Design a protein around this nucleic acid. Structure first.
Length: 54
DNA sequence: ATCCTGGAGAATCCCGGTGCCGAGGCCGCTCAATTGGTCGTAGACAGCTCTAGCACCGCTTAAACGCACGTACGCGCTGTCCCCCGCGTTTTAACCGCCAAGGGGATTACTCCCTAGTCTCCAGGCACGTGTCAGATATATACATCCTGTGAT
Protein backbone atom coordinates (compact mmCIF):
# COMPACT_ATOMS: atom_id res chain seq x y z
CA UNK A 1 0.00 0.00 0.00
CA UNK A 2 1.67 3.14 -1.27
CA UNK A 3 1.25 6.23 0.87
CA UNK A 4 -1.33 8.71 -0.31
CA UNK A 5 0.33 11.71 -1.87
CA UNK A 6 -1.00 15.04 -2.96
CA UNK A 7 -0.72 15.55 -6.65
CA UNK A 8 0.09 19.19 -6.17
CA UNK A 9 3.36 18.12 -4.65
CA UNK A 10 4.01 15.72 -7.49
CA UNK A 11 3.38 18.38 -10.11
CA UNK A 12 5.37 20.98 -8.17
CA UNK A 13 2.21 23.08 -7.86
CA UNK A 14 0.56 24.96 -5.03
CA UNK A 15 -2.95 24.73 -6.44
CA UNK A 16 -4.82 21.45 -5.83
CA UNK A 17 -4.88 19.03 -8.73
CA UNK A 18 -7.20 16.27 -7.58
CA UNK A 19 -9.80 18.88 -6.91
CA UNK A 20 -9.42 20.45 -10.31
CA UNK A 21 -9.78 17.02 -11.86
CA UNK A 22 -12.87 16.65 -9.79
CA UNK A 23 -14.32 19.92 -10.89
CA UNK A 24 -13.54 19.30 -14.56
CA UNK A 25 -15.31 15.90 -14.74
CA UNK A 26 -18.48 17.50 -13.39
CA UNK A 27 -20.30 20.77 -13.89
CA UNK A 28 -21.07 18.72 -16.96
CA UNK A 29 -18.07 19.85 -18.95
CA UNK A 30 -17.59 16.40 -20.48
CA UNK A 31 -18.28 12.74 -19.95
CA UNK A 32 -14.62 12.16 -19.37
CA UNK A 33 -11.55 14.01 -18.25
CA UNK A 34 -8.07 12.93 -19.19
CA UNK A 35 -5.37 12.60 -16.56
CA UNK A 36 -3.28 15.48 -17.85
CA UNK A 37 -6.09 18.00 -18.13
CA UNK A 38 -6.43 18.81 -14.37
CA UNK A 39 -2.71 19.11 -14.16
CA UNK A 40 -2.38 21.46 -17.14
CA UNK A 41 -5.18 23.56 -15.74
CA UNK A 42 -3.91 23.73 -12.20
CA UNK A 43 -0.66 25.13 -13.52
CA UNK A 44 -2.54 27.75 -15.50
CA UNK A 45 -4.69 28.95 -12.67
CA UNK A 46 -1.64 29.15 -10.48
CA UNK A 47 0.33 31.08 -13.06
CA UNK A 48 -2.36 33.71 -13.49
CA UNK A 49 -2.88 33.94 -9.78
CA UNK A 50 0.79 34.72 -9.36
CA UNK A 51 0.74 37.42 -12.00
CA UNK A 52 -2.04 39.32 -10.34
CA UNK A 53 -0.61 38.94 -6.87
CA UNK A 54 2.83 39.96 -8.01
C1' DA B 1 -5.11 93.16 -22.41
C1' DT B 2 -0.84 89.80 -20.66
C1' DC B 3 3.75 88.27 -17.97
C1' DC B 4 6.56 88.21 -13.09
C1' DT B 5 7.50 87.94 -8.51
C1' DG B 6 5.89 88.18 -3.44
C1' DG B 7 2.74 87.83 -0.03
C1' DA B 8 -1.75 86.05 2.24
C1' DG B 9 -4.76 82.30 3.01
C1' DA B 10 -6.41 77.76 2.72
C1' DA B 11 -5.70 72.81 1.68
C1' DT B 12 -2.93 68.86 1.64
C1' DC B 13 1.02 66.27 3.10
C1' DC B 14 3.84 64.27 6.86
C1' DC B 15 4.78 62.99 11.99
C1' DG B 16 3.85 60.47 16.14
C1' DG B 17 0.58 58.18 19.36
C1' DT B 18 -4.05 55.72 20.62
C1' DG B 19 -6.49 51.69 20.37
C1' DC B 20 -9.20 48.17 18.14
C1' DC B 21 -10.93 44.32 15.60
C1' DG B 22 -9.54 41.63 11.60
C1' DA B 23 -5.94 38.82 10.05
C1' DG B 24 -3.10 34.87 11.13
C1' DG B 25 -1.75 30.83 13.48
C1' DC B 26 -3.27 26.44 16.27
C1' DC B 27 -6.39 22.08 17.39
C1' DG B 28 -9.87 18.79 16.51
C1' DC B 29 -11.93 15.95 13.29
C1' DT B 30 -14.20 14.15 9.16
C1' DC B 31 -15.00 13.07 4.66
C1' DA B 32 -12.91 14.00 0.13
C1' DA B 33 -8.61 12.65 -1.94
C1' DT B 34 -5.61 8.69 -2.89
C1' DT B 35 -4.66 3.97 -3.91
C1' DG B 36 -5.49 -0.61 -6.43
C1' DG B 37 -7.96 -3.59 -9.36
C1' DT B 38 -11.55 -4.58 -13.28
C1' DC B 39 -14.05 -3.68 -17.53
C1' DG B 40 -15.05 -1.99 -22.15
C1' DT B 41 -14.95 1.35 -25.48
C1' DA B 42 -13.29 6.01 -27.22
C1' DG B 43 -9.55 7.28 -29.62
C1' DA B 44 -5.24 6.36 -32.17
C1' DC B 45 -3.74 4.58 -36.35
C1' DA B 46 -3.38 3.01 -41.14
C1' DG B 47 -5.60 2.65 -45.53
C1' DC B 48 -8.36 4.21 -49.28
C1' DT B 49 -11.71 7.14 -51.89
C1' DC B 50 -12.57 11.11 -54.52
C1' DT B 51 -14.32 15.95 -53.37
C1' DA B 52 -12.97 20.35 -53.98
C1' DG B 53 -9.36 23.80 -53.54
C1' DC B 54 -5.35 25.53 -56.11
C1' DA B 55 -3.17 27.23 -60.27
C1' DC B 56 -3.38 28.82 -65.00
C1' DC B 57 -5.39 30.98 -69.67
C1' DG B 58 -7.74 34.23 -72.38
C1' DC B 59 -11.65 37.51 -73.15
C1' DT B 60 -15.07 40.94 -71.91
C1' DT B 61 -15.97 45.00 -69.82
C1' DA B 62 -17.51 47.50 -65.57
C1' DA B 63 -15.01 49.27 -62.10
C1' DA B 64 -11.01 52.03 -60.51
C1' DC B 65 -7.66 55.80 -61.30
C1' DG B 66 -6.31 60.46 -62.05
C1' DC B 67 -7.44 65.28 -63.23
C1' DA B 68 -9.94 69.89 -63.38
C1' DC B 69 -13.56 73.03 -61.65
C1' DG B 70 -15.76 75.25 -58.13
C1' DT B 71 -18.29 75.75 -54.09
C1' DA B 72 -20.42 73.93 -49.53
C1' DC B 73 -18.31 72.94 -45.74
C1' DG B 74 -15.01 73.20 -41.63
C1' DC B 75 -12.54 76.30 -38.93
C1' DG B 76 -11.33 80.24 -36.29
C1' DC B 77 -12.71 84.76 -34.38
C1' DT B 78 -15.92 87.88 -32.11
C1' DG B 79 -19.51 89.23 -28.81
C1' DT B 80 -23.78 88.30 -25.94
C1' DC B 81 -25.95 86.09 -22.34
C1' DC B 82 -27.20 83.19 -18.80
C1' DC B 83 -26.42 79.50 -16.23
C1' DC B 84 -23.46 76.96 -13.72
C1' DC B 85 -20.04 77.19 -9.87
C1' DG B 86 -18.48 78.35 -5.16
C1' DC B 87 -19.58 80.03 -0.68
C1' DG B 88 -22.32 80.51 3.58
C1' DT B 89 -26.42 79.59 6.47
C1' DT B 90 -30.26 76.89 7.61
C1' DT B 91 -32.74 72.00 7.73
C1' DT B 92 -33.05 67.32 7.13
C1' DA B 93 -32.56 62.48 7.75
C1' DA B 94 -28.50 59.09 7.41
C1' DC B 95 -25.97 56.74 10.28
C1' DC B 96 -24.91 54.45 14.59
C1' DG B 97 -25.79 51.49 18.46
C1' DC B 98 -29.12 48.81 20.90
C1' DC B 99 -33.24 46.00 21.34
C1' DA B 100 -36.89 42.57 20.40
C1' DA B 101 -39.63 39.38 17.45
C1' DG B 102 -40.27 35.83 14.28
C1' DG B 103 -40.00 34.50 9.19
C1' DG B 104 -37.83 31.78 6.38
C1' DG B 105 -33.47 29.63 4.97
C1' DA B 106 -30.68 25.21 5.88
C1' DT B 107 -30.27 20.83 7.33
C1' DT B 108 -32.34 15.68 8.26
C1' DA B 109 -34.58 11.48 7.49
C1' DC B 110 -37.40 8.96 4.71
C1' DT B 111 -39.91 7.30 0.80
C1' DC B 112 -41.44 6.63 -3.73
C1' DC B 113 -41.48 7.30 -8.89
C1' DC B 114 -39.56 9.22 -12.81
C1' DT B 115 -35.74 8.68 -15.18
C1' DA B 116 -31.75 6.06 -17.47
C1' DG B 117 -30.54 2.02 -19.82
C1' DT B 118 -32.03 -2.16 -22.42
C1' DC B 119 -34.11 -4.53 -26.55
C1' DT B 120 -37.42 -4.72 -30.64
C1' DC B 121 -39.59 -3.00 -34.62
C1' DC B 122 -41.26 0.23 -38.20
C1' DA B 123 -42.20 4.88 -40.50
C1' DG B 124 -40.34 9.64 -40.54
C1' DG B 125 -36.98 11.85 -42.54
C1' DC B 126 -32.82 12.43 -45.66
C1' DA B 127 -30.21 11.72 -50.16
C1' DC B 128 -31.26 11.54 -54.84
C1' DG B 129 -33.97 12.44 -59.21
C1' DT B 130 -36.92 15.02 -62.19
C1' DG B 131 -40.12 18.95 -64.04
C1' DT B 132 -41.52 23.53 -64.42
C1' DC B 133 -42.38 28.05 -62.49
C1' DA B 134 -40.45 32.55 -60.04
C1' DG B 135 -37.38 35.58 -60.42
C1' DA B 136 -33.65 37.52 -63.11
C1' DT B 137 -32.50 39.61 -67.31
C1' DA B 138 -33.23 42.81 -70.82
C1' DT B 139 -36.29 46.03 -73.80
C1' DA B 140 -38.83 49.93 -74.15
C1' DT B 141 -42.28 53.40 -72.38
C1' DA B 142 -43.90 56.70 -69.22
C1' DC B 143 -43.75 59.27 -64.72
C1' DA B 144 -41.04 61.77 -60.86
C1' DT B 145 -37.41 64.48 -59.02
C1' DC B 146 -33.75 67.86 -59.53
C1' DC B 147 -31.46 72.47 -61.21
C1' DT B 148 -30.67 76.15 -63.96
C1' DG B 149 -32.70 80.38 -66.36
C1' DT B 150 -36.85 83.57 -66.61
C1' DG B 151 -40.14 86.64 -65.78
C1' DA B 152 -43.45 88.08 -62.21
C1' DT B 153 -43.68 90.30 -57.68
Amino acid sequence: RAKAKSRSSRAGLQFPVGRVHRLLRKGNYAERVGAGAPVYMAAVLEYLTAEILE
